[PDB]
Amino acid sequence: HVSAEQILRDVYKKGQKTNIDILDLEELREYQRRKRTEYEGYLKRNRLDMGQWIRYAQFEIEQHDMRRARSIFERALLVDSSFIPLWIRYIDAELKVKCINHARNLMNRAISTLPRVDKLWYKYLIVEESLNNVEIVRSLYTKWCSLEPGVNAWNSFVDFEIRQKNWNGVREIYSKYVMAHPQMQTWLKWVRFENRHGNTEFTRSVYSLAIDTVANLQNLQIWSDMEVAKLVNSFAHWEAAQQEYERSSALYQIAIEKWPSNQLLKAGLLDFEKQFGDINSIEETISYKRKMEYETILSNNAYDYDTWWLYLDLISESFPKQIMQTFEKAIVDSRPKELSKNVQWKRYIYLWMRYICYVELELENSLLEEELFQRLIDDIIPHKHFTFSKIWLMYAKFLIRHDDVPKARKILGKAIGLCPKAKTFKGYIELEVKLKEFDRVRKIYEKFIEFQPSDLQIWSQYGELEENLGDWDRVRGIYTIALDENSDFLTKEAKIVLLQKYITFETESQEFEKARKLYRRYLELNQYSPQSWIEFAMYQTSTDENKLEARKVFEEAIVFFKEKDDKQGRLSILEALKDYEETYGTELDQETVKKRFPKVYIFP
Amino acid sequence: KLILSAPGTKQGRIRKFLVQMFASLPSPKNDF
Amino acid sequence: MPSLRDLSLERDQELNQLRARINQVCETSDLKAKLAPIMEVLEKKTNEKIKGI
Amino acid sequence: KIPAAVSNWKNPNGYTVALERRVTINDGFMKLSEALENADKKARQ
Amino acid sequence: YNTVIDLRLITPAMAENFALFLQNHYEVMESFQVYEKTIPLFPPEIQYELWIEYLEVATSHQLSSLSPEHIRFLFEKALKNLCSNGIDCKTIFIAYSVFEERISGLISKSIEILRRGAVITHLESRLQLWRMCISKAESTLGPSVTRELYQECIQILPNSKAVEFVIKFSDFESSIGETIRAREILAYGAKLLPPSRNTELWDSFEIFELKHGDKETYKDMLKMKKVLES
Amino acid sequence: EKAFHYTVQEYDAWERRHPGGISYDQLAKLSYEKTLRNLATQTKVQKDTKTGKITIADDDKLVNKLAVSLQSESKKRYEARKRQMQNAKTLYGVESFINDKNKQFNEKLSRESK
Numbered sequence A: 001h002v003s004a005e006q007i008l009r010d011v012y013k014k015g016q017k018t019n020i021d022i023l024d025l026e027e028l029r030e031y032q033r034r035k036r037t038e039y040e041g042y043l044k045r046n047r048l049d050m051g052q053w054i055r056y057a058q059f060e061i062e063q064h065d066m067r068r069a070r071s072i073f074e075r076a077l078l079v080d081s082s083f084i085p086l087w088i089r090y091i092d093a094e095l096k097v098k099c100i101n102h103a104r105n106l107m108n109r110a111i112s113t114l115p116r117v118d119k120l121w122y123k124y125l126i127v128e129e130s131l132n133n134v135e136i137v138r139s140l141y142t143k144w145c146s147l148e149p150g151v152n153a154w155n156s157f158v159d160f161e162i163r164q165k166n167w168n169g170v171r172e173i174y175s176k177y178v179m180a181h182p183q184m185q186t187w188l189k190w191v192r193f194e195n196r197h198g199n200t201e202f203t204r205s206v207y208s209l210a211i212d213t214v215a216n217l218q219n220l221q222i223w224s225d226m227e228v229a230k231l232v233n234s235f236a237h238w239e240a241a242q243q244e245y246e247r248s249s250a251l252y253q254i255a256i257e258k259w260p261s262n263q264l265l266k267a268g269l270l271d272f273e274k275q276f277g278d279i280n281s282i283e284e285t286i287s288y289k290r291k292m293e294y295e296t297i298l299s300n301n302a303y304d305y306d307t308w309w310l311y312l313d314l315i316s317e318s319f320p321k322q323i324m325q326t327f328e329k330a331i332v333d334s335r336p337k338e339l340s341k342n343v344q345w346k347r348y349i350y351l352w353m354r355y356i357c358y359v360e361l362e363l364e365n366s367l368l369e370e371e372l373f374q375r376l377i378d379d380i381i382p383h384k385h386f387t388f389s390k391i392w393l394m395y396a397k398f399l400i401r402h403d404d405v406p407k408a409r410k411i412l413g414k415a416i417g418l419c420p421k422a423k424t425f426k427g428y429i430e431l432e433v434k435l436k437e438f439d440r441v442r443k444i445y446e447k448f449i450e451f452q453p454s455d456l457q458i459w460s461q462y463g464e465l466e467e468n469l470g471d472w473d474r475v476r477g478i479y480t481i482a483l484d485e486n487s488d489f490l491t492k493e494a495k496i497v498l499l500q501k502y503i504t505f506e507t508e509s510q511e512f513e514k515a516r517k518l519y520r521r522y523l524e525l526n527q528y529s530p531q532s533w534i535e536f537a538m539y540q541t542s543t544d545e546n547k548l549e550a551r552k553v554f555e556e557a558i559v560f561f562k563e564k565d566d567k568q569g570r571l572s573i574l575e576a577l578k579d580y581e582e583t584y585g586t587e588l589d590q591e592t593v594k595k596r597f598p599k600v601y602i603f604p
Numbered sequence B: 001k002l003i004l005s006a007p008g009t010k011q012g013r014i015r016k017f018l019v020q021m022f023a024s025l026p027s028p029k030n031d032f
Numbered sequence C: 001m002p003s004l005r006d007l008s009l010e011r012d013q014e015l016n017q018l019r020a021r022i023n024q025v026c027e028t029s030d031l032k033a034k035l036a037p038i039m040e041v042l043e044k045k046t047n048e049k050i051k052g053i
Numbered sequence D: 001k002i003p004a005a006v007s008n009w010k011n012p013n014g015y016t017v018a019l020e021r022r023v024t025i026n027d028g029f030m031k032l033s034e035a036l037e038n039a040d041k042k043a044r045q
Numbered sequence E: 001y002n003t004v005i006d007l008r009l010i011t012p013a014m015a016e017n018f019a020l021f022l023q024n025h026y027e028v029m030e031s032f033q034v035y036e037k038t039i040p041l042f043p044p045e046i047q048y049e050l051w052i053e054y055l056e057v058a059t060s061h062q063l064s065s066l067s068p069e070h071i072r073f074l075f076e077k078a079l080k081n082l083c084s085n086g087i088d089c090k091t092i093f094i095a096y097s098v099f100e101e102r103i104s105g106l107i108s109k110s111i112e113i114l115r116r117g118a119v120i121t122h123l124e125s126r127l128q129l130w131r132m133c134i135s136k137a138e139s140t141l142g143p144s145v146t147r148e149l150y151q152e153c154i155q156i157l158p159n160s161k162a163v164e165f166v167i168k169f170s171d172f173e174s175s176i177g178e179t180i181r182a183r184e185i186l187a188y189g190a191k192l193l194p195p196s197r198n199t200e201l202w203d204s205f206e207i208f209e210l211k212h213g214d215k216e217t218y219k220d221m222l223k224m225k226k227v228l229e230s
Numbered sequence F: 001e002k003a004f005h006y007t008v009q010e011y012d013a014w015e016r017r018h019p020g021g022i023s024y025d026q027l028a029k030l031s032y033e034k035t036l037r038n039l040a041t042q043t044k045v046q047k048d049t050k051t052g053k054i055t056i057a058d059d060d061k062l063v064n065k066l067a068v069s070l071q072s073e074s075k076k077r078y079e080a081r082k083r084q085m086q087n088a089k090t091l092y093g094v095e096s097f098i099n100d101k102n103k104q105f106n107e108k109l110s111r112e113s114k
């Protein structure tokens, strides 16, 4: 098939489609005249074409006419003296024809014109080094460095003197280089040199210069702390290698005294002391270092409550005087911004709970603890949105601890008022049960069932409540109310379960007749289900009178099945009669059930 | 980018009566 | 263990040959676990006071 | 890094480049349309 | 032994031979001084073995008197130094998580340590740390953290590796009851790879739709399969 | 298991024997260093009164070597670019073009998609 890509390939192939020799000077002149006219025409119309300038100069080089080539390069430099390739090409053209002095004059002009272009200095340097003009290279580096260049030029000068094995020259260069570039990597380059190319007297003297310098010039804040720290650590480790551990120890002590604000220096002393020191001094420094580490992690991320827990452990373990302050930071720093019980709030509340428990145990400051509860409940927890049930239950337990039980019930009622909660109600119920003021617990239960009316869980509790109180009549009334029409918010299965619980409770009280009445009511609620009839038969059996009651219940089940006009109901009734015969009857009733069995149904 | 529905999305006045019923309860004996 | 302690245990076993010649659901479950004993102590103190009342 | 310009109007060199190099929801509308549907049903009935 | 170490003639097997000699003679607290005197001398590749020995002895030995903040300091030092040199640090991360569970019981910190290991080229180890971190979070920390780990593991890992965790994320959401989130997670996972080389997700997608979907959604899954195959 | 038996000294020996975009100043220093490496593989003054100019006693062999080194490195670079151009002129997969400059332009456009 034709394609646009194919069409365009054919266009490309469709479009993609004499070597004269010069026999004498006259033909060469004609050729050169024509070429020069061409190049001059282009450069006249567009003098900014630096590439064309270079090509025209190279054309003159190929004619061996260096005077013309030089003139072309010069004219190009007149157009744009900043174009480094032009300068480099001109210098190379000069060197290729061995005109080393023209090249020198030109390289000197280049560095005089553009002294900040490193390429020109490196060109001059490499040219003189190729000619083994070591002293010229040295004078070049001396001038370059005197012009205060970047670190690259100083490093190159050091490398040059190292090539010359001129160790005193390298000392003198470093002596200037640390002034031009005070960064601590420059001093550490000098000490690194003296270690491999110098005596230990010099190495100690250069470290002492470094410290005396940062000490005297500290007021300028030239070096960052990390720089001074690396300088001191390097100096200490070097004295440790030289077996003079005492002088490294003195160095660390005096340096820490001079600059107490540098944590990195304390950590370096910890790193040193863990391998060259002793056991006793290591753990206090480790505790301080971990305090700093937790502080850094916590300031970077204030809602990292795992680290808050570890941080509080560390401070109360090693620095007992800072316990309270760090708590007052944990409360105010880690408080969430959101307005929901997400994981941050759930983990945050345990910092408050730990603060409360710590206060109560280690201080017994009831006034302060009451102040803490006031701050938490009234201010921090957004009650209109959510609340922690454990907080209010803990407040209740603490309040009862300090004999203000009426105020404990007052704050519990307040907790119910501002934000009802299932666990708040459950804990309130539990505490009031322990208080043994049982009459108040039922008034709690009514508020609970007002809060959420559908759950049978609350509905079932009055049963064993009034049973513990021994009020059979009140329990019966409560059970009747529970299954009444006013509780329509409960599901049908939940209502059946509550009715079953009430029936079991009534059976416990030996109220067989009331149990039978409730069983009939539950069968009415079960829409005369066959299982309801079976349960009624079982209840009659639990009421040889049991066998007669079972027979009467089987007859009632048969009558109910006939009333519903259901063959499946009749089969269920027959199965119930057979089961009663098998359990507490005889084979005669089983045969009767077989006679009442319908043919595959058609009852007979 | 893996965009998900928020967590919790799923596929696809009785207080007066409760108070009245509670107030109709008989007085407790406190026989315990 | 597997790299160097395993070799060194063999060394301390080879030295027996030298010795022969010598002689010849909750998102806050973890915090709950950590804080549980303090809660139990506070609960016992509450129980004692509430039994007093 | 300034991308190379490719014009959709001008092509001085007559180049060929890939086609790729050459080449509002408001509830008021729904509310209006359904109001007119309701008015239509109102009249029709 | 100390003179051998001073002469820098100590070899990694001899540095452990000394430490084991001291431990066998109940001088354990001075055993650790051997490990700290010798670990800095060797290259990081060997520092890994000596760090393993040091931390294994420090965390579990009746005579060690290192406080918990000290053992954490050792662990953080090991992980910083070795991971600064690219050495596989899986074993130290696992040991650190186990120790953090042991000493304080902060499961949340233990999981975060494992996640640090999996997030930091040893792709098989990072897949083992992602499986342990996520399984531990599922078993103990619940959805608010498990989702933030899953949606990071899937996002970071490349295709054909993250698909394993798309199936696992879908299973987690199906168990937690968010069937729709599971369905769209699996829908995201199906698009990662051609079904010719992506059968592992597709039979679990069929299983999920049979367990929790119905006829119309299952037919949508089949539409997705045939569309993806083209 | 064979590496656990090297002394600390042997580790020091082994660890010392076997341990985008560039600025013009950095490229310049690197080129200077390369030229010095190459030199390592290969390897008075008077001032007149009348003209005032200074003359240096250069070694004509070193001046010859310099001119030859510059000629040979220019040649090497030129040939490397020539080969690179032949490769570019034969590679395919780029968007359709109608002439060589159009091909180079489409390739330049392709390098922006990186």
Ligand SMILES: O=P(O)(O)O[C@H]1[C@H](OP(=O)(O)O)[C@@H](OP(=O)(O)O)[C@H](OP(=O)(O)O)[C@@H](OP(=O)(O)O)[C@H]1OP(=O)(O)O
Pocket: A341, A346, A387, A388, A389, A390, A391, A421, A422, A423, A424, A426, C026, C028
């Ligand atoms: O609303 P509830 O059915 O009473 O649920 C509460 C409640 O959970 P929510 O706040 O999410 O509703 C508690 O949380 P807080 O009020 O204390 O913040 C929670 O406690 P945790 O926060 O520790 O999970 C408690 O569970 P538990 O009883 O184990 O403390 C649980 O109570 P239930 O389990 O009885 O429902």
